[PDB]
Amino acid sequence: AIKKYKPTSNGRRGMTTSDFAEITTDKPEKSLLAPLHKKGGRNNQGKLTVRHQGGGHKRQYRVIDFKRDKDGIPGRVATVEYDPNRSANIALINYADGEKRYILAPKGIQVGTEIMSGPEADIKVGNALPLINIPVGTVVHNIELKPGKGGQLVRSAGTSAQVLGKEGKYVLVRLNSGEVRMILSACRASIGQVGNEQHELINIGKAGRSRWKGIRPTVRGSVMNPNDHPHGGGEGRAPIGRKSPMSPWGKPTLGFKTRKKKNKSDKFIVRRR
Amino acid sequence: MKRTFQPNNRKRSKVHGFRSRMSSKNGRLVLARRRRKGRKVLSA
Amino acid sequence: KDPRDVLKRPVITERSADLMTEKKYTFEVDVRANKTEVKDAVESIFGVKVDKVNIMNYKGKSKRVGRYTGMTSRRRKAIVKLTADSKEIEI
RNA sequence: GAUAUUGAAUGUUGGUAAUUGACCUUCUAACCCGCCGCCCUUAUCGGGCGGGGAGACAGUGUCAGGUGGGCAGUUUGACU
RNA sequence: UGAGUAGCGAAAGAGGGGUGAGAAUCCCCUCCACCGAAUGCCUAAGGUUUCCUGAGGAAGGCUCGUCCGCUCAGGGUUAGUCGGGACCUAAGCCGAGGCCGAAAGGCGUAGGCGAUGGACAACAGGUUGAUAUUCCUGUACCACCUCCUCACCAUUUGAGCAAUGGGGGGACGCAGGAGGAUAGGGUAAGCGCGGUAUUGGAUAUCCGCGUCCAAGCAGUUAGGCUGGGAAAUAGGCAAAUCCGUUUCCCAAAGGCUGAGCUGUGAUGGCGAGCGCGAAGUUCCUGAUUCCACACUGCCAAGAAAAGCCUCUAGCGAGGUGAGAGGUGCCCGUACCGCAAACCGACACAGGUAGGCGAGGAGAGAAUCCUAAGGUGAUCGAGAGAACUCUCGUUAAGGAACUCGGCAAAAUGACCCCGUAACUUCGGGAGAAGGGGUGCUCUGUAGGGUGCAAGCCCGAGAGAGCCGCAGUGAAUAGGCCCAGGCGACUGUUUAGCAAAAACACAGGUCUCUGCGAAGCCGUAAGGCGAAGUAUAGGGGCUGACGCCUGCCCGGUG
RNA sequence: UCUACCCAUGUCCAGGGUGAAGUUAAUGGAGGCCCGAACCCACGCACGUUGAAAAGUGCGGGGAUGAGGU
Ligand SMILES: [K+]
Ligand SMILES: [K+]
Ligand SMILES: [K+]
Ligand SMILES: [K+]
Ligand SMILES: [K+]
Ligand SMILES: [K+]
Ligand SMILES: [K+]
Ligand SMILES: [Mg+2]
Ligand SMILES: [Mg+2]
Ligand SMILES: [Mg+2]
Ligand SMILES: [Mg+2]
Ligand SMILES: [Mg+2]
Ligand SMILES: [Mg+2]
Ligand SMILES: [Mg+2]
Ligand SMILES: [Mg+2]
Ligand SMILES: [Mg+2]
Ligand SMILES: [Mg+2]
Ligand SMILES: [Mg+2]
Ligand SMILES: [Mg+2]
Ligand SMILES: [Mg+2]
Ligand SMILES: [Mg+2]
Ligand SMILES: [Mg+2]
Ligand SMILES: [Mg+2]
Ligand SMILES: [Mg+2]
Ligand SMILES: [Mg+2]
Ligand SMILES: [Mg+2]
Ligand SMILES: [Mg+2]
Ligand SMILES: [Mg+2]
Ligand SMILES: [Mg+2]
Ligand SMILES: [Mg+2]
Ligand SMILES: [Mg+2]
Ligand SMILES: [Mg+2]
Ligand SMILES: [Mg+2]
Ligand SMILES: [Mg+2]
Ligand SMILES: [Mg+2]
Ligand SMILES: [Mg+2]
Ligand SMILES: [Mg+2]
Ligand SMILES: [Mg+2]
Ligand SMILES: [Mg+2]
Ligand SMILES: [Mg+2]
Ligand SMILES: [Mg+2]
Ligand SMILES: [Mg+2]
Ligand SMILES: [Mg+2]
Ligand SMILES: [Mg+2]
Ligand SMILES: [Mg+2]
Ligand SMILES: [Mg+2]
Ligand SMILES: [Mg+2]
Ligand SMILES: [Mg+2]
Ligand SMILES: [Mg+2]
Ligand SMILES: [Mg+2]
Ligand SMILES: [Mg+2]
Ligand SMILES: [Mg+2]
């Protein structure tokens, strides 16, 4: 549920939060953590290549099992946990052999739920099968693009995709965006919608809360100078004053499609979003 | 008022020192020029 | 190395004279010499029993004779305490 | 877009006397893989080997057209 | 030349004595004054001998100079334990092969380097002109070694050692509150030592000063977390008697840790005071420190690696434990360090991380005056004009001033009463507006601490007293009505603009199916993201509320 | 070595007030919350303008648990 704060100050006015009712423990699994330093949107040259990224809270990386490749061994859901590195919650799985792993927490998973990977697994929320084994109409998440690589698509909080049909070697899947696409049938997908569906409703409330999440301010092009941005300059406020709205680097940025026109995956994409 | 020169021997040596100069072609040209001019001090 | 390369010369000061009453002998030593080498050198040369060697480095002093500035040599000074039951060194 | 890297088949439709074109589909063996396993090897680099995916496409070279204040060099008269 | 002109850089000195060729300026003494959450003490960076002693007075010192951070001599820095290295890793940097690139080179794997972090054994007192967890005294601890001593275990299921491997651990945020404790404080009581005053009074509930103590070792403790045992085991690159998991069996124990306290250390040391040396207890108060990120709460979800422990894999004829004897390197250590020694060209009203930071009254690190301790400021002497500056006061009037109440004045603390429009129901609000506030006696009610005397804290009254005035000084909101703009806290033109500009939460459009788009780079390699459409980039708008019409010809 | 932003790792912030959620009027202790030192800033005025200072000083001023300072 979304908790709404009372307006005890102007900062707090309209601010909302997760109640974190799903989260069953505060402490992560020490063995599945890795270090994760901030980059500030700087690349290997030390240069800022993405704007508006920097600062925010320190975070440890939780190693998530996107592959879901322990076929046959049953796994008990031990915890549902906050992960700072992603919108979804994660679930610690205790496998019967004593291996521990994190997965993405699906909607309506519970502590003590048994889960199973592989072609022989049941079609139940938390399980992970090859798409050849998943029946048509099944809501899935954490979809592989290449066999064995790990789930890449449909991982964010509340997101879901649907298996539409099997074309032998490929399976049709409606992705979360609404795009319909051929996925190799050997690729795995996890059963269910991703949990933490309310995430999108959160009203961040104040500037400082965006800063905690590592988002530095966006300055509009219109209030820069001509040497900085195509929209810069003009005496007083100015309209766009150009044929198209423009990016900082002088490309059209409203409607202009940027997917590469010769793309190898074009054949796999059946219906665009 | 905080002025521009804030001395620090580590930073002096790391930025301007002999090993820094020797670590690049252009730094080696600095040393070659200063030797050619006949400087007492080649580097920090 | 030779023992007599380690010990350069005795320090003859009021301080060093006061130390000799306490059975401590001050030497200028080779700048590279560690205090174990100094201990071994004193025992070899003088035939005494060393309790401990304390050692210190002195920087070169800036100096002038007219216009020409320059530095004195850096020095390594060893204060060699002999044991209670030991022969004294003859300076 | 042409052409090189660039191969093999099956169709179909040109043009010359059975060869050579054009295009469609298929193939695998070049090429590619920011996919998996194994080894070099204590290695999220690289390379090798074996799967898988893709495939004569892509990528890259040469040539060509379009777009292109993103950037560059400049011009923007004189009388008064 | 200007000109013997401007200036001589925030500040309290006065006299006596001394030295000397010479003294406002150097030394000594006395009293006075200044700082005292510092102008004290410690210690970074930085400086590099400026430190100490003796001698000096050309220059430097805004004057002088016998003096000095200056000149000349000579001297001074002592470590197994402090800080750094012979330990560990972060960001980043370097980078065998490697990838990429006209050349130069760029990138990057293994592997390293790299503290601002992790780890890690010594304390108290004394001493020099100048060093001191470094020297000395006393009492310790850590690692390693074996000519030795003693005990115990064992020579192929055979002690023991044990990985560069596995596992555990290390290992982490922010806020809040309550405990426990200790520094520190009060001198309350007791104790000790000294004093009894000549200015009216006082063996007085009189005056002054002092009133302790380490690491280590042994014991103990507020407590803190932790559930443990036994089998079996698709996992932990091999193996595991370890870890993980499961199932049974007990729910108090066991672990792991603990500030501090007590004994000892100490037949010692320190100690008012006069080399000698008294008392050296208790009570009260009490942290911003420690127990301890322990607990509780919260979302923004809070390094790594080693030391350490354990496990096997290995290694093994001698081991293990205790004693005794022994070994323990290099670098720094002077001095300045809110400053005349560093950064500002200066002996410059500026800047300079961190630790400690006492008392009275106090909520306090505010404020004023003081303590410990430090200091009197590097031109002076007069005169007391204009004018300028910084202050204080001002008849009557009270914004008439002025672009504008600019400046100044006023308000100011605590307690009690009372408090509007409007509102997003939080606010507005310390709204506004009133009243009280000292001292004495009753003398407290009550509370904390203690076994109790006692010691702190302490309303609310009643009756009195004094002044022009009682938060009698210093320090402590002026307030209200209405309107434009921007919702808000933030941000900005270092050095003429702080704003209505930027940002912002929210809104919307758009791109982006992941080798994503976008971006940096010739490329390799990267950022995006160890993210995956509830995500990421770009444009515009800018809380919230009500809303956001018409036009697709032109341009995109 | 100034400054802009970022990265890793430390550290600093006297005191007082208000009283969100939650819990059972009390309890609780939220906040780019309030008042206010240190610290950071630089709104007004004066002075300074061959300065004590190539941006300061004095008296007032803003922030002061945060989008914080260092
Ligand atoms: K808000
Ligand atoms: K903006
Ligand atoms: K403009
Ligand atoms: K003060
Ligand atoms: K002198
Ligand atoms: K020293
Ligand atoms: K602005
Ligand atoms: Mg952005
Ligand atoms: Mg502008
Ligand atoms: Mg432009
Ligand atoms: Mg424009
Ligand atoms: Mg206009
Ligand atoms: Mg030493
Ligand atoms: Mg142009
Ligand atoms: Mg030209
Ligand atoms: Mg003309
Ligand atoms: Mg004309
Ligand atoms: Mg005259
Ligand atoms: Mg004149
Ligand atoms: Mg005159
Ligand atoms: Mg004058
Ligand atoms: Mg002066
Ligand atoms: Mg005073
Ligand atoms: Mg001196
Ligand atoms: Mg003079
Ligand atoms: Mg150390
Ligand atoms: Mg490199
Ligand atoms: Mg090489
Ligand atoms: Mg360090
Ligand atoms: Mg230590
Ligand atoms: Mg000293
Ligand atoms: Mg010292
Ligand atoms: Mg100064
Ligand atoms: Mg008090
Ligand atoms: Mg005080
Ligand atoms: Mg008047
Ligand atoms: Mg009057
Ligand atoms: Mg008027
Ligand atoms: Mg007028
Ligand atoms: Mg005013
Ligand atoms: Mg504003
Ligand atoms: Mg300005
Ligand atoms: Mg201004
Ligand atoms: Mg690329
Ligand atoms: Mg990446
Ligand atoms: Mg706008
Ligand atoms: Mg419109
Ligand atoms: Mg049209
Ligand atoms: Mg605030
Ligand atoms: Mg400061
Ligand atoms: Mg500023
Ligand atoms: Mg304030």
Residue numbers in the entry:
A (entry chain C): 2 to 274
B (entry chain 2): 1 to 44
C (entry chain T): 2 to 92
What's the paper's own text on this?
Unlike B. subtilis RqcP that is 86 aa and comprises only a single S4 domain, B. subtilis YlmH is 257 aa and comprises three domains. In addition to the C-terminal S4 domain (residues 171–257), YlmH contains an N-terminal domain (NTD, residues 1–74) as well as central domain (residues 87–166).
While the NTD and C-terminal S4 domain were generally well-resolved (2.5–3.5 Å), enabling sidechains to be modelled with high confidence for the regions interacting with the rRNA, the central RRM domain linking the N- and C-terminal domains was less well-resolved (3.5–5 Å), enabling only rigid body fitting of an AlphaFold homology model. As expected, the C-terminal S4 domain of YlmH is located similarly on the 50S subunit to RqcP, where it interacts with both the P-site tRNA and H69 of the 23S rRNA. As a result, YlmH establishes additional interactions with the P-site tRNA from residues located in the loop between β-strands β4 and β5. The density for the nascent chain at the PTC is consistent with four alanine residues extending from the CCA-end of the P-site tRNA. We also observed density for the antibiotic chloramphenicol bound within the A-site of the PTC. Chloramphenicol is a context-specific inhibitor that binds stably to the A-site of the PTC when alanine (and to a lesser extent serine or threonine) is present in the –1 position of the nascent chain, providing an explanation for the observed co-migration of YlmH with 50S subunits on sucrose gradients in the presence of this antibiotic.
